[PDB]
Fold this sequence. Notes:
This is part of a larger assembly, with two copies of chain A (429 residues) and two copies of chain C (430 residues).
Chain A: E1 3-9, H1 10-27, H2 42-45, E2 51-54, E3 58-61, E4 63-67, H3 71-78, E5 90-92, H4 101-105, H5 108-126, E6 130-138, H6 143-158, E7 163-170, H7 181-195, E8 198-203, H8 204-214, H9 222-241, E9 244-246, H10 250-257, E10 265-271, H11 286-293, E11 310-319, H12 323-336, E12 349-354, E13 363-371, H13 375-389, H14 395-399, H15 405-427
Parallel strand pairs in A: 1-4, 1-6, 4-5, 6-7, 7-8, 8-10, 11-12
Antiparallel strand pairs in A: 2-3, 9-12, 10-13, 11-13
Helix pairs in contact in A: 1-9, 5-6, 6-7, 7-13, 7-15, 11-12, 13-15
Chain C: E1 4-9, H1 10-28, E2 44-46, E3 52-54, E4 56-60, H2 64-71, E5 83-85, H3 94-100, H4 106-118, E6 125-131, H5 135-152, E7 156-162, H6 174-185, E8 191-195, H7 197-208, H8 215-234, E9 237-239, H9 243-250, E10 260-264, H10 269-272, H11 279-286, E11 303-312, H12 316-328, E12 342-347, E13 364-372, H13 375-390, H14 396-401, H15 406-427
Parallel strand pairs in C: 1-4, 1-6, 4-5, 6-7, 7-8, 11-12
Antiparallel strand pairs in C: 2-3, 9-12, 10-13, 11-13
Helix pairs in contact in C: 1-8, 3-5, 5-6, 6-13, 6-15, 7-8, 11-12, 13-15
Amino acid sequence: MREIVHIQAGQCGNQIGAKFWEVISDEHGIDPTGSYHGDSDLQLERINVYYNEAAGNKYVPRAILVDLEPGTMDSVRSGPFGQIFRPDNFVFGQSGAGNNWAKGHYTEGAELVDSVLDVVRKESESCDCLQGFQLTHSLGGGTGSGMGTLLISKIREEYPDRIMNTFSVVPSPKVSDTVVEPYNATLSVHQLVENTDETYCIDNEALYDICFRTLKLTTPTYGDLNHLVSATMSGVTTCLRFPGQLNADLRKLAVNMVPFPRLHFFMPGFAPLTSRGSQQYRALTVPELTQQMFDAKNMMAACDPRHGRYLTVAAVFRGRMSMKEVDEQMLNVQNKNSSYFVEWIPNNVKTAVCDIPPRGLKMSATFIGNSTAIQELFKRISEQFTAMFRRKAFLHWYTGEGMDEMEFTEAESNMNDLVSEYQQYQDAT
Amino acid sequence: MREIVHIQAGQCGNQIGAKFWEVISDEHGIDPTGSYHGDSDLQLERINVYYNEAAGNKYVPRAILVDLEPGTMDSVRSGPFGQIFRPDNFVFGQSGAGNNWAKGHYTEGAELVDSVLDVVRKESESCDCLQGFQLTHSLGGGTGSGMGTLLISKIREEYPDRIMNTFSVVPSPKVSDTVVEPYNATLSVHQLVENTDETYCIDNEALYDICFRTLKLTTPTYGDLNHLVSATMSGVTTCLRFPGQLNADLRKLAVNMVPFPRLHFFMPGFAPLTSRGSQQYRALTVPELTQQMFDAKNMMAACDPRHGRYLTVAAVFRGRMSMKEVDEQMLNVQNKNSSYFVEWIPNNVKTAVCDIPPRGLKMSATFIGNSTAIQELFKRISEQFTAMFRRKAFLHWYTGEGMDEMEFTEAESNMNDLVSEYQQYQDAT
Amino acid sequence: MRECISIHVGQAGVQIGNACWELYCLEHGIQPDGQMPDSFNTFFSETGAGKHVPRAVFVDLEPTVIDEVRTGTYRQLFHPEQLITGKEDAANNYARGHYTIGKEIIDLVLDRIRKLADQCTGLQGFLVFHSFGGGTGSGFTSLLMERLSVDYGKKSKLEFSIYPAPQVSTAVVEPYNSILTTHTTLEHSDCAFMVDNEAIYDICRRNLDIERPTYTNLNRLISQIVSSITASLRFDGALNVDLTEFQTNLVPYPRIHFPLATYAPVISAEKAYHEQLSVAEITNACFEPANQMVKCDPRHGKYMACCLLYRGDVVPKDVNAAIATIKTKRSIQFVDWCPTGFKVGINYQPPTVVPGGDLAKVQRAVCMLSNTTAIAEAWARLDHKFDLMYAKRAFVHWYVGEGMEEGEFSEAREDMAALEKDYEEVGVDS
Amino acid sequence: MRECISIHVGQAGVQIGNACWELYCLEHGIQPDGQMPDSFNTFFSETGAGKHVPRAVFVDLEPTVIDEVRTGTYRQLFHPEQLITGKEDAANNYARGHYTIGKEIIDLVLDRIRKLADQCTGLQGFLVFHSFGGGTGSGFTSLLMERLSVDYGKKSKLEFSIYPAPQVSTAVVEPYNSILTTHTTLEHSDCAFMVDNEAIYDICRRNLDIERPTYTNLNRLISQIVSSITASLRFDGALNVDLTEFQTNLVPYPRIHFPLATYAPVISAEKAYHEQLSVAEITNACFEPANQMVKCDPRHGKYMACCLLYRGDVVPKDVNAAIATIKTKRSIQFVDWCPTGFKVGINYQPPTVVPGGDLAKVQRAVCMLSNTTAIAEAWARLDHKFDLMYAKRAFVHWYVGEGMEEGEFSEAREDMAALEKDYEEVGVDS
Ligand SMILES: Nc1nc2c(ncn2[C@@H]2O[C@H](COP(=O)(O)OP(=O)(O)OP(=O)(O)O)[C@@H](O)[C@H]2O)c(=O)[nH]1
Ligand SMILES: Nc1nc2c(ncn2[C@@H]2O[C@H](COP(=O)(O)OP(=O)(O)OP(=O)(O)O)[C@@H](O)[C@H]2O)c(=O)[nH]1
Ligand SMILES: Nc1nc2c(ncn2[C@@H]2O[C@H](COP(=O)(O)OP(=O)(O)OP(O)(O)=S)[C@@H](O)[C@H]2O)c(=O)[nH]1
Ligand SMILES: Nc1nc2c(ncn2[C@@H]2O[C@H](COP(=O)(O)OP(=O)(O)OP(O)(O)=S)[C@@H](O)[C@H]2O)c(=O)[nH]1
Ligand SMILES: [Mg+2]
Ligand SMILES: [Mg+2]
């Protein structure tokens, strides 16, 4: 009953993915071997959403791990929880893509993709009623971006009526992690606009800010960053996996959040978030949570929601709390912050409530904002793309792999059109 | 009640045969001396199918071991279980055939054949109700191929109303094990088409692939390969030897699988097959087994079933399982893979179920596919034959033994006709 | 799995190789006899029981330098067939290296490479160590590269090069050798890492307080840089960079494939105790011109790509912060066609220190590979040097005597002129 | 049961025999006195109580070489009647070997063979060791073969031959001897394994690091090859090959019965420690022209049959893999009439090593028997040599003086011309 298929591409994709898996196992009372050692029957009731049941009271993630290089895979295998994964679900190459989108999409990735697809199909067939697919990856590299997009394209072709959702780690504004990342992002976005139903935009710049400023982590590590992402991810599917009072799911959320097909790029957020010492000096009531959710400093995308308008916002609450209170809070935010919400979508806040809170907390919240401010990010990428492409810088690395200028051009154009569309709705009255 | 007579020819034939015997003894609770040390009365009920009862609570294989060279025989005798065999049932020459079909069929083999035949007749007379004969051998050498075919011919002449089944190890496509193997195979096939009722095609290339890819055996040995073959073999007779819910036998299987007399060349398969570590991470339910059975990577013949169509498929299941489930699975495979099944044989899947599973497993499956793709194999052999015969290469080795070109020619022609026939049914609507 | 084949050509290449393989052994816990009481495997193949052999070829046209290896401490480390020697050297003559002497052993060298490559399951590529100035380093290397390009195709090839100094030469004919080998190798090399002996000496004197640094010291320093480049492949890291990634991220146009290496921190133990070496601090050190290993001025050029490879106790956020501040800095200008100029690698393993070495043990290190229009200056200098001698046909008769044609000189020179113009064109803003 | 009779003719044949029987004894644990403190039995008959005697005949027309055997370490190993000597040698004259001197002992030799054969229950055939160049190796051997063909018929006969080198001769009349004996033996031999002293010396120098290899070394090497050929008969194996199988699988036409032997690995202990010797690795070694034991170029010819005999720690799948990759390789081309070119044997017993030998102890070995159109070159050379001397009738008077007729020379030459044409015809594609 509503199986989700999990797919992980590249170093980023696999590191976030592992963390996510760790989070989920703890929640469902699963140990590093796949055995259930939980307390309550509710933990196992909907375990089939993420786990296949193997022989001898074991549970195995419906997870496929993909990379053109093996090192990351090896690391995962050696990690805590590495042994829970199905050995045949690790699909790795030997070559790599050399941070090149073309290599991931057309060359090395192409050589590996069929093997992935075979596994994927099998996984799909395992499931009684497949909800769809969640892909974790970056847009800035070669495998996650080129191979990942290719995978998406094929999956969509095979299963056009299932939901495709992505958790994409997007390039940062202040500093680039690679030189060609604008190319890789731009190309990837071209595919994503046509082939995903919803995309959570996650940015490391925002994450670091959150960790340093809000969590009071002097020197945050990538693991810590991943943890936040995992928390968000778990939050989005919580209403599918546990009983609630007003239950959401992936389809419903998409319907509420996506008024036009191309505008499916969300700014995710998570609340609460406190230091170790600071948590004793405040109570986690619903209004506090709401307040934490609605501000720029708590968004995991490097763009200010106050630079645009919210088209829609979905809030997913976990824990025992009063529905009336929640509703009041939702009303209040709309009323007081009227200028940040588009006027032609009345009651543009959607609420879901799941009775099971995450571990360690009595209540939590997950925020999904569809804000016209995300256009800024796209614009930056377009600018950076242009600056390089106009001088044909690095182009021979991509053309050498069989790619043509036309493809680049079209991709750019598509991106530009999306930006224009975003602008149009931002400005509409 | 339904005695089977077992015959082994040449090195291959004897190595596979020994393994088979070992498998069978374990199943029926027989130790290396011929004494029953099993637990249940069901193990002895139908022991007469493969064993003669000797004096003093001993059981002896109804097995005849034949070779033109003695070394293999000696090895067998010295092996674990070597002492279980009747000493008078080892019939060996001193000369060999020098990898020459002619020597096996007309010369050295001819000198030895009468001695074999005498034993065979005696064995037949021992039995209350002889089902027929199973021959294990290769087609690529001289003894298994030439002598074996000769033996078959004589046996058929003597006992035309009994079933003749063969487990033939066929030449590989990528690499040849001998230079003249196309000649030896082609000649052998000429005999097999006219004189066997059913032939299981087993190919070492496929076997290695299975062992390396599926079983995760880094460096498989011939013993391991033989084990797989033995498992298949035991599977085909399981319903004759143990009580079941829907019982098959050799005759029934032949009837179901052979719609036209010449088309009796099967691609055998066995399921399940897993690594040592990987078995804990999956349950052996019937659908899983079915899935394992129906794919190209699990076939023991080096040809892709997706390159042709299935005329018929027989599936034999062992263990306690639900008949309904089995039926559903059978239906499902037919429905979803419609294009790989000939349209003019409705319900072309035959099912048998035996309640006794093999040792170590709770359930297993054996697959017998009659696929038009096997024509590829024959075509390859024909091509290779032609390439050599057109230049009369190596021909003096065969003509020197009294053979004429006409015989070769006729053999070639027969092979070609078979291929044509296969093609015709593949293409028919 | 991800094997790397190292080729050491001529005296420079061999001696540097000595330092590199010494370091690798210490890093992986391999003894000088090949024994150890899984990461090693990209650099060492494994044989029988308790022995590990470098994935390397050492080649020189004379026996003397390699004979030291054969008779030395690491005699048991290498298999005899991977230590290749001729009888007579190339005598600082590219012609002898490329043609007369080199054509006698090229087949042999390549045969051994083929044998090495046959035992690789996931060959990443080749690391070639040599100099621009020697007859072997120039002529043989060019020959070798040509053959490799033919027989292996698009497999990644990387060069570490002892580029000639502005005012510190050994040979008189260095400019000729440099020019010809650059010309001949250009279309066959994917990325070449220049390093200059003068600069390293300065570093040794200024930063390490060494009155009289020896070639050994320089070699040791080089070994560190090489280790940083390959540590991402030999060890587990937070954020990883492989040999294929450099050429994508550091080479914007095919001909402009000369990034420069800078390593930090280079300090003595006595000086290390009074300093806390943060990521920001070492990055700043790197991005200051005095710590560069080529005697050139980036303040007078523009950056086209910077790749920063951090190792040890390093935290991604910190690196980001460090880079951000360097971005602001006046002395760092980037070309106008490149808004994203940084590629960043972070590896968990701290730099290993060779017993009896000149460097102190640090918690963090960083190796920058940067590509700068300032390199044009060096090329201009070299061209000028060539021009002065060639105008008089000084030494030319030697080259012709070894089978080179005079027209090829002019050809080399014009190609280099073109290269110089290419840099200039790249320099200007859109 | 499956007995094999060995015949050693002339100095070469006898000396090689010494090396072979020494090896066999070590392999079966037979002491030099015939004692041991069941596999032996194909090569050794057994007498009374605690003594084993070689199924062998050693023949030479002079006493000196066999006298060494009689007085030497293995004096007690052989029965006196199996060591046969005349008084005067054939003096590098085929005529003396075949007629004048040979006709005096041929009856004796054959009588002893008959006695040997009478104690065989399952005679597989004969292994004949000799040279092409000597008067005994050429003339006597031809005589012997003729008689054997008559008295034993279709029993398999195999030859191991010291084929003359291209530029390393002992005698001047070698070409004459070679040509005549090839002519006379052709229709009587089923398969003959050529081996060349020059090639073996090269192998010894290059692969074993021996400055000055002796005939002893060559003999030892040969003994290995022979052991590989017969190990499938002397030991238990996974997949087996017998003496009758070779001629079926290696001889495509009656006259084209000259396959060549290649053995791998041939290494010293010092060199063996830095190498892991896989099936793929040794197969590749074999299939490279420098390790061949005839000085000829397969790259310039085509393969008609390859038979690969593996021994020791060898796994069938691995062998298959190895062969598959070699099939792809550009340097291996097969004739168009032969899509299946490989016969493969695999035996469990590792190669045994002679105490004080030049070869290191290995877990695996392989012996390839391959038949190549490249052998035509050798024949052409030999014919040319014959022509040069015969045009002047140089040395001819000797042969005529010993009862040969001049017409027989021309006959031999024309037959060889025909042979050469046959190879050529075979060469071309359909
Ligand atoms: N860094 C460093 N540079 C070296 C070393 N040895 C030589 N060089 C430099 O290399 C150049 C001389 O080249 P060599 O490698 O000795 O010459 P070669 O390659 O053997 O060429 P020929 O002897 O001419 O055949 C000069 O610029 C030297 O300063 C060394 O150990 N370390
Ligand atoms: N490999 C090898 N070749 C040998 C050996 N002894 C001699 N030869 C070669 O055999 C040829 C000479 O023939 P021999 O066998 O000495 O002569 P022969 O057969 O005794 O004939 P005559 O003395 O003429 O009666 C030359 O090509 C030698 O190089 C040996 O021990 N090993
Ligand atoms: N949040 C988070 N971001 C990461 C992680 N690893 C990498 N990134 C970010 O992702 C981008 C590069 O991701 P990476 O994993 O190298 O992609 P890749 O496609 O696997 O790289 P490649 O195989 O083409 S070379 C960089 O912007 C980096 O900052 C991680 O573990 N967590
Ligand atoms: N699966 C399997 N295949 C084998 C075995 N032994 C041989 N073969 C295969 O059989 C073929 C040759 O079989 P072999 O046993 O030599 O036939 P033979 O007739 O006895 O050979 P001969 O006496 O004429 S020389 C080869 O293709 C080889 O790969 C075995 O034990 N198991
Ligand atoms: Mg030098
Ligand atoms: Mg002599």
